[PDB]
Every structure is written in structure tokens, then in C-alpha cells.
Design a protein around this nucleic acid. Structure first.
Ligand SMILES: Nc1nc2c(ncn2[C@H]2C[C@H](O)[C@@H](COP(=O)(O)OP(=O)(O)[C@@H](Cl)P(=O)(O)O)O2)c(=O)[nH]1
Ligand SMILES: [Cl-]
Ligand SMILES: [Cl-]
Ligand SMILES: [Cl-]
Ligand SMILES: [Mg+2]
Ligand code: NA
Ligand code: NA
Ligand code: NA
Length: 326
DNA sequence: GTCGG
DNA sequence: GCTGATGCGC
DNA sequence: CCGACCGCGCATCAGC
């Protein structure tokens, strides 16, 4: 929080471009700037100083000067006053409602939490569950709770098939003291890039977790990716825990390292690493890292035996999970 | 909105 | 039904 | 300047 005021300002700007303006590149431009500044070990004294960092250009430099001089930004002040922008920004906070849906609802007169509640019929499945747990999904998850959650997930998975390997990734693997949700990477020997010898591998696990009442709702579910809701069990007479978002990704067992790298993040770290990969002539996804031929077409998967091998290919020193929070 | 060639 | 584009989210 | 901006699973829709 050394330059919290500035990073918060850029984040709000980023959210505006994304939610209201539907300008994804500007969104990421602001996010990159916020990121590099949050990483900066000094208390910024001027926009000129900030402009030295990659990602911070003229426009943002001017904004930082204004914020330092007055403690605020007029551009944001006007945005906050705008009701449409405010309404669209708010609605996008519901899981399942993005910029388009948010602008459409506002067009229909639906602009508040109360409005959504009296219009459930106009929401799809995902949006309905996001509204249901709106309050809860805004809460943080203490690492202590993440630990109890990990215990339940790993043990239940083990009960279905001892050959399953469940790994909690996301901010948790990065060592965060609190997480916004739980991210679970899952592998099983019968599912490789070479073949699928067993169907319902992901289904079985989801099923088991619902059986024990851990998973309470489903936002989306396919053969390899589950997106839903879970809840820790509470003791007698005590208030129950908030419901939490849970994502489970089944990845070919032989592509574990690319999968755990992807699912460990951060999202900005992944974007930076994938972009660097390209510059180095490689393309990276959650499955593999491939060289880019002369034409720029991806070649065959390169051998990977650790997360480090991936870093080595793009000529980056290895970075522990805890140092990938950008 | 920012950057490299 | 399928395929492709688009919205959404990780 | 100006083209590039990471890469992809699932739900939903149009058009067939
Ligand atoms: N390449 C890529 N990977 C992504 C992206 N978004 C997410 N990931 C990958 C990297 C992410 O680390 C991982 C998990 O996604 P979460 O949204 O849960 O992100 P975190 O868990 O990091 C925290 Cl925001 P928390 O949940 O605790 O608040 O998915 C994206 O746009 N691109
Ligand atoms: Cl844009
Ligand atoms: Cl791998
Ligand atoms: Cl691939
Ligand atoms: Mg997460
Ligand atoms: Na700069
Ligand atoms: Na949303
Ligand atoms: Na997640």
C-alpha cells in the first residue's frame, strides 16, 4: 500500500474502461500501470518519476500529478457522479453479469440490487446464483479457512479415487494471507494428452463434493472445468460460513506443470509471461509451451518437467509462486 | 493507454 | 442437431 | 506513426 492511492485510482479507471467503455485494451493498460506501480519500492513523488516505469505513459503521468497535488482525480469524480456508469459498474459486480449484460439491464430500467431481485426471471442460471450469493462473494477468505477447505477437498477427492491429485492454486499457492476464492487443479492418470481412459473424471469429484454438502451450487460445468459454489461446515449453534466461489480444472496429467503455472497466476503475471514468451518466439497456454515457427505458427509441444523448464525456455530466472503476484 | 521497430 | 461468434470468467 | 495487446472452457445465441 506504499502507493495505494495511485494504484486504487488506476484500478478504478481500469474497471471503468472495462465495464462502461468496453475498452479492453485500455482496461489492461491501466491494470499494467497499477501493477508496475504496486511493485515499485518507493513512494512516488511525481508523474515524471512514475513515467519512468514501463506501462506508465504521458496520460497516466498527468493523472498521477493531479492525484498527488489534490488527492483525487476529476475524471473519476465525474464518472462517480454519472448514474449510468455507476449502475453499469455496480451490476458487473454480480458474477455472470458482464459489461454488455450490465448495460442492457440498465437499458431495461434494472439498475439496483433491489431491481435484480425482482427480475430474477430475466437472469440466466449463472447470473441467478451470483445474485443469490452477491454479498458472500464480496467477502475475503482467511487463509485458515482456505486450509480447512483444502483439507476437505483433498480428502474427498482421495475417497473417490486414490490416484487423483488435487492441488490448490491461485493466490493460495502464492502464499496469500487471504483469497477471493478457491482454485483447484485436478489430475488423474487415466486422463493424459494421449488419451481419456475414464469418463466422468471431473463429474465424480464434483458429485462427491456435493454429496458431502461442500459444493452447494453450480455456475457452469464441463468435462474439464467446473465453476461453482462451496461452503465450510459449521459447528452446533454457530453462524455458518459465507458461501465461496470454487473453480476446479481437470488437466491432462502429463501437462501438469503448464497447468499449475497457469492456475497459480497471477492473471497479470500470466499475461506478462505469455507476452514475453511470444517475444522470445514461444507460445504458452495451460497445456504446453511451443516454439513459434518462421510463419509464426505454433510447433509441437516442448518437453517440460517442472515449472522452471518453462521459465528457462523463455530465458527468465525462476520465480517462486510467492513472487508471481503482479 | 502504452509500447517497440 | 451442428458450427461459429460472442459474452463471461478463470 | 501504428499494429499489437495471452489464451481458452463453458453457456448461449444465430443461422443452417
Ligand atoms: N492466462 C490467464 N490466466 C488467468 C486469467 N485469469 C485468471 N487466470 C489464472 C491465474 C490465476 O491465478 C488463476 C486463478 O484465477 P483467480 O481469478 O482465482 O485469481 P487468483 O486466484 O489469482 C486471485 Cl484474483 P483470488 O481468487 O484469490 O482473489 O487463473 C487470465 O485472464 N489469463
Ligand atoms: Cl480498448
Ligand atoms: Cl507440463
Ligand atoms: Cl496445446
Ligand atoms: Mg482464485
Ligand atoms: Na514509462
Ligand atoms: Na460480473
Ligand atoms: Na478462481
Amino acid at each position: 500500500t506504499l502507493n495505494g492511492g495511485i494504484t486504487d485510482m488506476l484500478t478504478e479507471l481500469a474497471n471503468f474502461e472495462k465495464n462502461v467503455s468496453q475498452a479492453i485494451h485500455k482496461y489492461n493498460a491501466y491494470r499494467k500501470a497499477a501493477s508496475v506501480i504496486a511493485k515499485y519500492p518507493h513512494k512516488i513523488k511525481s508523474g515524471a518519476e512514475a513515467k519512468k516505469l514501463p506501462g506508465v505513459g504521458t496520460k497516466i503521468a498527468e493523472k498521477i500529478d493531479e492525484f498527488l497535488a489534490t488527492g483525487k482525480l476529476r475524471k473519476l469524480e465525474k464518472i462517480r457522479q454519472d448514474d449510468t456508469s455507476s449502475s453499469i459498474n455496480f451490476l458487473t459486480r454480480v458474477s455472470g453479469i458482464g459489461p454488455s449484460a450490465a448495460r442492457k439491464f440498465v437499458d431495461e430500467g434494472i439498475k439496483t440490487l433491489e431491481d435484480l431481485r425482482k427480475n430474477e426471471d430475466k437472469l440466466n442460471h449463472h447470473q441467478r446464483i451470483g445474485l443469490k450469493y452477491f454479498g458472500d462473494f464480496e467477502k475475503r477468505i482467511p487463509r485458515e479457512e482456505m486450509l480447512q477447505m483444502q483439507d476437505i477437498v483433498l480428502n474427498e477427492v482421495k475417497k473417490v479415487d486414490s490416484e487423483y491429485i488435487a492441488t490448490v492454486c491461485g493466490s493460495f499457492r502464492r502464499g496469500a494471507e487471504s483469497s477471493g476464492d478457491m482454485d483447484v487443479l485436478l489430475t488423474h492418470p487415466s486422463f493424459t494428452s494421449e488419451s481419456t481412459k475414464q469418463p466422468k473424471l471431473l463429474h465424480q469429484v464434483v458429485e462427491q463434493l456435493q454429496k458431502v454438502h461442500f459444493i452447494t451450487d453450480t455456475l457452469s460445468k464441463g468435462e474439464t472445468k467446473f465453476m461453482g459454489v462451496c461452503q465450510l461446515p459449521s459447528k452446533n449453534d454457530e453462524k455458518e460460513y459465507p458461501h465461496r466461489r470454487i473453480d476446479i480444472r481437470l488437466i491432462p496429467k502429463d501437462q501438469y506443470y503448464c497447468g499449475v503455472l497457469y492456475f497459480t497466476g497471477s492473471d497479470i503475471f500470466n499475461k506478462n509471461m505469455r507476452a514475453h514468451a511470444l517475444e522470445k518466439g514461444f507460445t504458452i497456454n495451460e497445456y504446453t509451451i511451443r516454439p513459434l515457427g518462421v510463419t509464426g505458427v505454433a510447433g509441437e509441444p516442448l518437453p517440460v518437467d517442472s515449472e522452471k523448464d518453462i521459465f528457462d525456455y523463455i530465458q527468465w530466472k525462476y520465480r517462486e509462486p510467492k513472487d508471481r503476484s503482479e
